[PDB]
Design an enzyme around this catalytic site. Structure first.
Site, PDB file in Angstrom:
ATOM      1  CG  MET A 116      -2.288   0.192   0.912  1.00  5.61           C
ATOM      2  SD  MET A 116      -2.459   1.810  -0.159  1.00  5.61           S
ATOM      3  CE  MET A 116      -4.179   1.520  -0.617  1.00  5.61           C
ATOM      4  CG  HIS A 117      -0.017   4.527  -1.291  1.00  5.46           C
ATOM      5  ND1 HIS A 117      -1.129   4.171  -1.456  1.00  5.46           N
ATOM      6  CD2 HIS A 117      -0.044   5.803  -2.280  1.00  5.46           C
ATOM      7  CE1 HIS A 117      -1.794   4.884  -2.288  1.00  5.46           C
ATOM      8  NE2 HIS A 117      -1.502   5.782  -2.618  1.00  5.46           N
ATOM      9  CB  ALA A 118       5.594   4.327   1.185  1.00  8.92           C
TER      10      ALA A 118
END
Lengths: 255, 85
Positions: free
Chosen positions: B15-17
């Site tokens: 998830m993203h970062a």
């Protein structure tokens, strides 16, 4: 009367003010100082003042602003606090380097490492790092700090929308901001947009002639007026009050 | 001994970062050291921001997550669960 790309719909009126954020790299000097411990400890003491200041900063945003902001900072907060960065700085001092410059050099060396990355999804982080160093530079001297300037109402005028910059000034006194670039879905462009705060880009004007002049930003029409004939502004209020205060109201442009 | 697991990055380490950021919190909540490695043989130490940036370029590449300790399983499982979405 300037046509700017509207990044965030909405209209707001206020003076133009630039952040006290100015290049401090030109202050890079070379010399030898005897303060192995004094410097090392000075850094740690500064971190507690900076690290705690950063953690508290985001904490405030999360309480309001957005969740993305916290995710960004929170990540950086651990960075500076990471025994990795601290150890690195202390390493330079072990040779006889000064924190003031050492911290700047360390951050500069990392800037290149961050860029080396191709994935912009994070690589851009470099820009954020630079801002982090600026905060440490000021924190490195208990003789410089303070809100920097907490006015009553105004807008931010920077060449590029920097999340770190906003995380420095209070939103309460900050409504909108016009940038000359910060285009695309920049971390600060995506956070501000989701925040619902008027924002415009493409402004080809310098802040020099903005000091505290009057600037009306119109996210809806992404237009920037300059102390225009008060008469015209008068009709504007009546134009929206007309009825179709939604679309773009029957106006000129391509008839 | 140590416990690792190969995970294919489908252009999304998760998830993203958050996954990378959460890892730092998990390492403190769970006893065990977590280390990431790209098929290129690049050790993306989870304890290094520079490593995380390198992983970002691993969009579509294979990596080998390694975890050592008593909870190594949890740490590794947590990372795998986040990577699998």
């Amino acid at each position: 009367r300037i046509r700017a790309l509207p990044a965030a719909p909405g209209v707001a009126i206020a003076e133009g003010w630039q952040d006290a954020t100015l290049p401090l790299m030109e202050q890079v000097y070379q010399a030898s100082t005897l303060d192995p411990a004094l410097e090392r400890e000075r850094l740690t003491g500064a971190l507690e003042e900076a690290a705690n200041e950063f953690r508290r900063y985001s904490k405030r945003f999360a309480a309001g602003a957005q969740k993305e902001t916290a995710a960004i900072f929170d990540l950086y907060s651990h960075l500076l606090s990471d025994t990795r960065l601290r150890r690195e700085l202390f390493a330079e001092v072990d040779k006889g380097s000064v924190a003031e410059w050492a911290v700047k050099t360390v951050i500069e060396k990392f800037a290149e490492q961050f860029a080396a990355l191709s994935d912009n999804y994070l690589k851009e982080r470099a820009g954020d790092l630079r801002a982090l160093g600026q905060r440490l530079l000021f924190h490195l001297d208990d003789a410089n700090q303070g809100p920097n300037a907490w006015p009553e109402r105004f807008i931010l005028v920077a060449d590029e929308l920097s999340a770190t910059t906003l995380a420095e000034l209070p939103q309460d006194r900050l409504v909108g901001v016009v940038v000359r670039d910060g285009a695309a879905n920049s971390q600060a462009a995506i956070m501000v947009r989701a925040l619902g705060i008027p924002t415009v880009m493409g402004a080809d004007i310098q802040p020099s002639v903005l000091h505290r002049r009057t600037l009306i930003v119109d996210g809806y029409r992404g237009e920037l007026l300059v102390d225009p004939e008060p008469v015209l502004l008068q009709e504007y209020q009546r134009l929206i009050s007309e009825e179709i205060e939604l679309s773009r109201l029957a106006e000129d442009d391509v008839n | 001994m140590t416990v690792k697991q190969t995970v294919e990055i489908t252009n999304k380490l998760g998830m993203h970062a958050r996954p990378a950021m959460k890892l730092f919190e998990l390492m403190q909540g769970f006893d065990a050291e977590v280390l990431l490695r790209n098929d290129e043989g690049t050790e993306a130490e989870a304890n290094s921001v520079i490593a995380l940036l390198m992983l970002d370029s691993a969009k579509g590449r294979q990596i080998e997550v390694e975890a050592t300790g008593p909870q190594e399983e949890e740490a590794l499982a947590a990372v795998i669960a986040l990577f699998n979405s």
